[PDB]
Design a protein around this nucleic acid. Structure first.
Ligand SMILES: Nc1ncnc2c1ncn2[C@@H]1OC[C@H](OP(=O)(O)OP(=O)(O)OP(=O)(O)O)[C@H]1O
Ligand SMILES: [Mg+2]
Length: 748
DNA sequence: CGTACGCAGTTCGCG
DNA sequence: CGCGAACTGCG
């Protein structure tokens, strides 16, 4: 099995290192024959004598063109003649890249920014996470002493806990009488003992939770001050910290640092992403949280340290139990995309698409287009197109509604119609597929680049979905849904990649066509089911609709639904297939993207309502459900109002716990870039003002205290809330949190 | 580093 | 006030 891939320099030459695990033994394979390169297109081949002479300057020593090779490739399915410009060191490319392209006889250059380590995996056709090996895992967390206003890692690390298959332990430099706590003299020896523990166990994977932005950065600065060689890598190297825009990423050579934070973000939608909330959402078990203020009081006074030891212990145990479940999903994801687990688990949709396309483009001798410069990126940013069709819903209560949705509509349209930049308006074809509204033509004489790839991705999604119904244990089935939902978003991401401003294969006309076909296929199917089968589409969004048959019983509307499915599926071309997504007893439709339905088993399904939105407190989500049950299950509006008065009167009497009054909202940029300061911004700013780091993606959890004026003026972080000192705003959480979401529903 | 558009809903400043 | 803008998140 291939774990990762990097390169070192030996006498000026790059040496690709392949970290592998075969037959249960970690090994390092060396390749000193790979040479960096990038392509260049010229006007006349006579200029090749002048391009070889082009030199640049890299830290004193000169850099020259090592070797050249005229090769025959294809640029978007069309023949192209480029020259392979070879170089000694990979870092020689960024020094001479702009100057070779600057030659008057050079049209453009290509493939000059692919990292040399990833270039080795693509060119040699290596796929990581392949094989029968069972990796060894070990999670770890740290408990650090904090005081308001102190610099990062100014206070010392108090405890270092680790966990794996043999249990969990904590290392601290103060006496704690618990059987799983190893007592130690000083903090430096505590860090040293943990370093020896990782070395003795030699885990291939290191599980952390936000270790990319805290744990490894804290252990680093502490090791600098204490003079410790924190050699965690299998080559005796210290963990490297990398910058990724606004967040940091930490790599460990020879192993795989599996930070659980970015994985859970792209996998589960939660109002808060604390380790305690994530552990509860996945396993159904509650985790106690000890705050940075109590741990200080426990350390300076000495009493209560046993409680803090359990917190750090559980922090490592919870992280190992969480990492043991989500690694198999990312391992297969690393297999499909073709990049290491370390890079894939931290990447969004844009690179998960482009990396797989880069690997497949090399297989087909397809010269990859370049990422746009700053200007072309800004031009594609403002560029947009029409999206999906949303019908203004039919208001009122309705009976016996069925939900019909298209199966992978956007990927089906891409493959059925061969939507691809190497296909868009290709000259000389005998068969075309014209898109409605936009009018873009697409050749069909041969499978396009992207459509030939998107086929296998849908099969993988249907492979996990088929395993979901066959699995009975509630935990595995929950993880398989996360898996399929991860592949489903990845598949539709190939459409968004067409309109992605930083995409190499950016094809806006491809993106306009996909949504244009999507709008035509949903509006035609809606009309067909209304005039030909007697259905009545009450609401529709992009690729699905809810429609009953007036006066018909349940069994007939379900039988006629599957009947219409065979009719429209026999009329749809290619992979377009309408699916039966479920039957609903009674259903509500307030407005666009907001509805509430009940099923035959009395379960309440909602869409886009405040019950799901994060920026609504729990007392709002709790009350809305009670009004939703009385209306859809009990069918009685008067009790629904009676529930509201009881909750509203409860907030007035200061009777609801402050845990059910926390409003969460995510920071989406640097705090200085904000133009309008809301409540969650006013709290985020007051955290960076006193030392608390705030990066984009941070979820601000605040509570609104009693006062007058701006809501953000009296909003404080919930961790700062003490019920003896702060009294929450009874009127705000009434008039602004509970009534509006229910009053909008009670309009019916 | 950073998939797409559509659109309901809230906070805030202000005339 | 309540529109207009900024802002978020869901589907
Ligand atoms: N995050 C997204 N980014 C881009 N396009 C998307 C996204 N989500 C959905 N689409 C596309 O927008 C329309 C459609 O959304 P469904 O997710 O509701 O349906 P499937 O088609 O995914 O597959 P199933 O029905 O789950 O078997 C999808 O094609
Ligand atoms: Mg669908």
């Amino acid at each position: 099995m291939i774990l990762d891939t990097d390169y070192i320099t030996e006498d000026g030459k790059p040496v690709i290192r392949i970290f592998k695990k075969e037959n249960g033994e970690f090994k390092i394979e060396y390749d000193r024959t790979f040479e960096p390169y990038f392509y260049a297109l010229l006007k006349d081949d006579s200029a090749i004598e002048e391009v070889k002479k082009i030199t640049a300057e890299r830290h004193g020593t000169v850099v020259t063109v090592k070797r050249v090779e005229k090769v025959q490739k294809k640029f978007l399915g069309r023949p192209v003649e480029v020259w392979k410009l070879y170089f000694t060191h990979p870092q020689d490319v960024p020094a001479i890249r702009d100057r070779i392209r600057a030659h008057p006889a050079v049209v453009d250059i290509y493939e000059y920014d692919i990292p040399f380590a990833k270039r080795y995996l693509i060119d040699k056709g290596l796929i990581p996470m392949e094989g029968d090996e069972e990796l060894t895992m070990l999670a770890f967390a740290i408990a650090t002493l904090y005081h308001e206003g102190e610099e990062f890692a100014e206070g010392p690390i108090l405890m270092i806990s680790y966990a794996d298959e043999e249990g969990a332990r904590v290392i601290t430099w103060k006496n704690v009488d618990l059987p799983y706590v190893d007592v130690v003299s000083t903090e430096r020896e505590m860090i040293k003992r943990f370093l020896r523990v990782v070395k003795e166990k030699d885990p291939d994977v290191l599980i952390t939770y936000n270790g990319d932005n805290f744990d490894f950065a804290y252990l680093k600065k502490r090791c600098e001050k204490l003079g410790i060689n924190f050699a965690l890598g299998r080559d005796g190297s210290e963990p490297k910290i990398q910058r990724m825009g606004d967040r940091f990423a930490v790599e460990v050579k020879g192993r795989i640092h599996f930070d659980l934070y970015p994985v859970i973000r792209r996998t589960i939608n939660l109002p808060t992403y604390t380790l305690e909330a994530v552990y509860e959402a996945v396993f159904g078990k509650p985790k106690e949280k000890v705050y940075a203020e109590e741990i200080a009081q426990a350390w300076e006074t000495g009493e209560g340290l046993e409680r803090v030891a359990r917190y750090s212990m559980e922090d490592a145990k919870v992280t190992y139990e969480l990492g043991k479940e989500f690694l198999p999903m990312e391992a297969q994801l690393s297999r499909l995309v073709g990049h290491p687990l370390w890079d894939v688990s931290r990447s969004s949709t844009g690179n998960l698409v482009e990396w797989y396309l880069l690997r497949k483009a090399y297989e087909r001798n397809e010269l990859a287009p370049n990422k746009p410069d700053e200007r072309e990126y800004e031009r594609r940013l403002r560029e947009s197109y029409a999206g999906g069709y949303v019908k203004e819903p039919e208001k009122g209560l309705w009976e016996n509604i069925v939900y019909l949705d298209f199966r992978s509509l956007y990927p089906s349209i891409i493959i059925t119609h061969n939507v691809s930049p190497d296909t868009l308006n290709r000259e000389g074809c005998k068969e075309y597929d014209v898109a409605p509204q936009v009018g873009h033509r697409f050749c069909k004489d041969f499978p396009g680049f992207i459509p030939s790839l998107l086929g296998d991705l849908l099969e993988e999604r249907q492979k996990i979905k088929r395993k979901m119904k066959a699995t009975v244990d509630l935990l595995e089935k929950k993880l398989l849904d996360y898996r399929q939902r991860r592949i489903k978003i990845l598949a539709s991401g190939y459409y968004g990649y067409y309109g992605y401003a930083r995409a190499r294969w950016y094809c806006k006309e491809c993106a306009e066509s996909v949504t244009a076909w999507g709008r035509q296929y949903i509006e035609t199917t809606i009309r067909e089911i209304e005039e030909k089968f007697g259905f009545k589409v009450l609401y529709a969004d992009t690729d699905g609709f809810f429609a009953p048959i007036h006066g018909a019983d349940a069994e007939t509307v379900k039988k006629k639904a599957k009947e219409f499915l065979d009719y429209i599926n026999a009329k749809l071309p290619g992979l377009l297939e309408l699916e039966y997504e479920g039957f609903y007893k009674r259903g509500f439709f307030v407005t666009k993207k907001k509805y509430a339905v009940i099923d035959e088993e009395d379960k309440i399904t909602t869409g886009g309502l405040e019950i799901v939105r994060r920026g609504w407190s729990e007392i709002a989500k709790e009350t809305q459900a009670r009004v939703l049950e009385a209306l859809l299950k009990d069918g009685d509006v008067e009790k629904a109002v009676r529930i509201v008065k009881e909750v509203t009167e409860k907030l007035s009497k200061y009777e609801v716990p402050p845990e059910k009054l926390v409003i969460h909202e995510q920071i989406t940029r640097d705090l200085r870039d904000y133009k309008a300061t809301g409540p969650h911004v006013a709290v985020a700013k007051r955290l960076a003002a006193r030392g608390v780091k705030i990066r984009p993606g941070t979820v601000i959890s605040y509570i609104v205290l009693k006062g007058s004026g701006r809501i953000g003026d009296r909003a404080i972080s919930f961790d700062e809330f003490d019920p003896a000192k702060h009294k929450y705003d009874a009127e705000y959480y009434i008039e602004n949190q509970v009534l509006p979401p229910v009053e909008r529903i009670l309009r019916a």
